[PDB]
Structures are given as C-alpha cells and as structure tokens.
C-alpha cells in the first residue's frame, strides 16, 4: 500500500469488491405482508460479513492491530453500506437499489416512521454521484478512504503502538489520494480539474458521515438488532484462525 | 468569488473573521456556582450573531437567496462554532479555549453528563490541527467550505432557481479549492504534497460533521434553548433592512 503503485492500488481495490446480495423474501407472495425494516435489516446483516472480507483486502488494513481494525469498522460500517447503496442506485433516478430484487422509491420509505428522511438524503447523494459521473475506480478509492478515515480521530489512548498505527493509516490515505489524482490525470483532466474533482469527491464524504449519523439515530429506536455489542461481533469475525488455509 | 483571485479570496476571508468573544460571568466569584452549560450556551448564542455577519462577507454567500442562506447556516452553525473552537484551542494542548477567560480541560467536561465525550472529540481534532501545523489562511478556507458545503445536498425541491443556486455554490467551492492549492504552492509544497494536504484537510471536515451531529444529539436533551425555531431566528437575522446604511 506504501510501495504499491497507483495502478496496483486501483486493481487491488477492484479485485476486493464484495458481491451484490439479494433480498431474502418469497417473490411469489404479496408485499404488504413484508416487514420493510425486516427485509432491509436482514440484507444489511448479510452484507456485513462480506464487508469484513473486503476490508481485509484493502491495502494496509490487515497490517493494523486486530483492535484497531475493529474500531475502524465499528465507526464506518454504516457509511460503507450507504456509499455502496448510493453507488448501485446511481443509474436508477428516484430509486434506491437496496438489492437487484429490492428497488424502492421515496414513497416506499414512508412505510417506516422517520425513514423517508433518510431515503431522501441517500437519493440526493445518488443524484450527485450521477451528476458528477462518478467512476467505478473513484468509488472504490472513496469507500477505502471511509474505512480508514472515519474512526482514526477517535482512537482513545496514545501508546507508542497507537501512534505508529495512526501514522500508517495516514500514509495509506495519502496513497489513495495519489491514486485518485492518478486516475483523474489518466482521464485527461487538467491539473486544475484534478484538484477540484478531488475536493468535490472528498466533500461528499462529509455528507455520507451525516447520513450515517442520522441513520444510527434513526435505527437506535427500533427492533433492528442490538444483541451482543458490535465490537465483540466484529472482533469474532475479524479474529479468524488460519486453519481453513 | 468567481472572478476574485486566489489572493483576493484569502484576503476577503481574513478580513471577514469574527471577533473572539468572552465568557460572561463574574470573575470575582467562585466557580462551583456557575452553570457550565449556562456559560457555554450564552457564549455560543452571542457568537451566532457574529457568525451571520461573517457569512455575509464570505464571497458568493449573499448572492444566494435569503432562503438558501438560512438553510446553509441552519445546517452548518454547530460545525462552524466547533472548527472555531478547535482552531483557538490549537496552541493549548489538552484544553479547549471556549473563550480567553474560559479554558477547560477534559475533567472540567465531566461536570456535564455526556459532555466529556464531545470534549474528547474536539480535543483530538485540535491536536490533529496542531500536528498538521494548520495555517490561519487554510483555516478560513476550511470554515468557508463548511458554510457552503454542509447543507448543499439537502435543498428539498429542485426549481430552476434552486438548480442555479447549487451551481453557484459548487463554483464558489471550486474557487476555495483553487485558493487552498495556491496557498500550499506558495508555501513551497510539491505538487504531490499539495494534493495530499488538500485531502488531509478536507477529510477532517468529515470529523467536524461527526462532532456536530453528536453535539446536536447531546444538546437535544437539555435546557439549552429551543424557543422559536432556528429557521425563523436565522431568517430574522439574515433578512436585514438596509436603513442603517
Ligand atoms: C451490520 C449491522 C446492521 N444491523 C442492524 C440493522 O442495520 C441496518 C438496517 C437497515 C438499513 C437500511 O437498509 C440498507 C440495506 C443495505 C444497504 O447496503 C444499506 C441500507 S441503508 C438503510 C437504512 C439505514 C439507516 C436508516 O435509519 C434507515 C435505513 C441499514 C442498516 C446490525 C449489524 C451489526
Ligand atoms: C446558535 C444556537 C446555539 N444555541 C443553543 C446552545 O448551543 C450550544 C451550547 C453549548 C455549546 C458548547 O460550547 C461552545 C461554546 C462556543 C463555541 O464556539 C463552541 C462550543 S461547543 C460546546 C458543545 C457543543 C455540543 C455539545 O453537545 C456539548 C458542548 C455549543 C452550542 C441555540 C442557538 C440558536
């Protein structure tokens, strides 16, 4: 990640992309009888296992301690799901493609109290991506930045080890910045367009943080799931043996 | 703002800086008897009038409709107060300089339920600014970006006028990006350091959004003040006559 080229980061990031999952409900049955939140929650929980997989393939992530890996994912998981959703919704104006067999419009979000507000924010982000003509190569860089950036300011303590971890993370972030600029230059943007586009992309990440924060507030008031704290469940998942090697 | 130079934006932004206010409490009296939240709330309300003043001097802001000006400030006001606080706290490791006569450490935040968590996040941002050696010229650009960026994705409708406003805002944001790159080049950074530093700065804005969101959640559960909705109070303030010209 720190000696990988900009072309190697791009291909590592493309190679690491997770699969597109489907909603799990019987399509031979009516819809009024489905719990929309139940459908969405079940989807999101299944994505989380693939997210851990993906994160381990982001250059530099697994060189972190297990504790720091847990922290970053605990901080970024909803942001990561949401940029993923906005990305596959890009080509579907006015709709969110939760899954290939679960495409919802804003009125379908009114079904859940306080959810249309979140839908509207996601929908607006999807339209901005569309207006910017965001590219697959740029999107994977952005998702990796979310993973590494979102919880890097909240590491508690400040041990020697902790200091080293922070330095490495900021080093990897620098390399993804170099990769985004490289992508843009390749595409034929001027120096000036490059830095402007870089800023445009990075400023969207402030909106994705906003959506995550608002979505956590909204989720935190519902059946959803809050069994076994998230840290411990992430740890479990990340603290793998290497027996099935 | 769209024909202003990078040097003209910088000087307009420096010229527009608001004053540093003091806490209003009798310094000849003990401290256990003060409401810390009362002190902080009174400080923050006094800053808001100066914030409106400042925003009107940001290049491009007053060319927006009154409604859009209200929206952006309603979305960004806590982010703007917080970056301001982290900026004047930079030279005071382990402390937050709320005002020149009100410098608090984390233990002083434990006095309020759930406030130490916010203090710790602000303190960590202040240390990052310090570690990056953030410059006065960079800070004013960043505060202006917060003003223009934070609520630009949440404008409801999408009228012709609305579309025009968005275009102008993104145009002004582009010019502040050009200004930040200009500042960095002047300072002698390489091309590579410039784009890396730009990204480092912009990624901090995602943490400031985080702090604002968490602070609104925390404020929203206390005496504070929620009399007359914020929109109407902002409108009042922004919808000035020009009689005292
Ligand atoms: C991975 C964690 C998620 N599990 C709890 C439920 O989480 C979610 C439930 C539903 C969704 C909602 O559905 C999805 C589904 C997939 C996806 O990639 C994105 C979203 S976003 C949306 C959402 C988010 C926040 C809201 O306030 C409203 C709608 C997203 C997450 C707990 C588990 C540890
Ligand atoms: C401008 C709006 C603010 N008024 C309500 C009270 O708002 C505030 C009250 C206290 C502060 C707290 O004190 C200050 C004071 C000045 C400053 O520049 C920053 C801060 S930050 C801090 C804070 C913020 C959020 C928390 O959860 C905990 C501490 C910041 C804002 C309502 C008014 C319309």
Swiss-Prot record, chains A, B:
Shown chain mapped onto the complete sequence: 307 to 551 of 595
Job of this protein: Nuclear hormone receptor. The steroid hormones and their receptors are involved in the regulation of eukaryotic gene expression and affect cellular proliferation and differentiation in target tissues. Ligand-dependent nuclear transactivation involves either direct homodimer binding to a palindromic estrogen response element (ERE) sequence or association with other DNA-binding transcription factors, such as AP-1/c-Jun, c-Fos, ATF-2, Sp1 and Sp3, to mediate ERE-independent signaling.
GO CC annotation: chromatin; cytoplasm; cytosol; euchromatin; Golgi apparatus; membrane; nucleoplasm; nucleus
Lineage, broadest ranks: Eukaryota, Metazoa, Chordata, Craniata, Vertebrata
Record's keyword annotation contains Transmembrane: yes
Protein name per Swiss-Prot or TrEMBL: Estrogen receptor
Effect noted on mutating residue 80 to C: Loss of transmembrane localization, no effect on peripheral membrane localization. Impairs activation of estrogen-induced activation of NOS3 and production of nitric oxide. No effect on binding to ERES
Modification Phosphotyrosine occurs at: 231
Compartment(s) of residence: Nucleus; Golgi apparatus; Cell membrane
The family this protein is said to belong to: Belongs to the nuclear hormone receptor family. NR3 subfamily.
Related illness: Estrogen resistance: A disorder characterized by partial or complete resistance to estrogens, in the presence of elevated estrogen serum levels. Clinical features include absence of the pubertal growth spurt, delayed bone maturation, unfused epiphyses, reduced bone mineral density, osteoporosis, continued growth into adulthood and very tall adult stature. Glucose intolerance, hyperinsulinemia and lipid abnormalities may also be present.
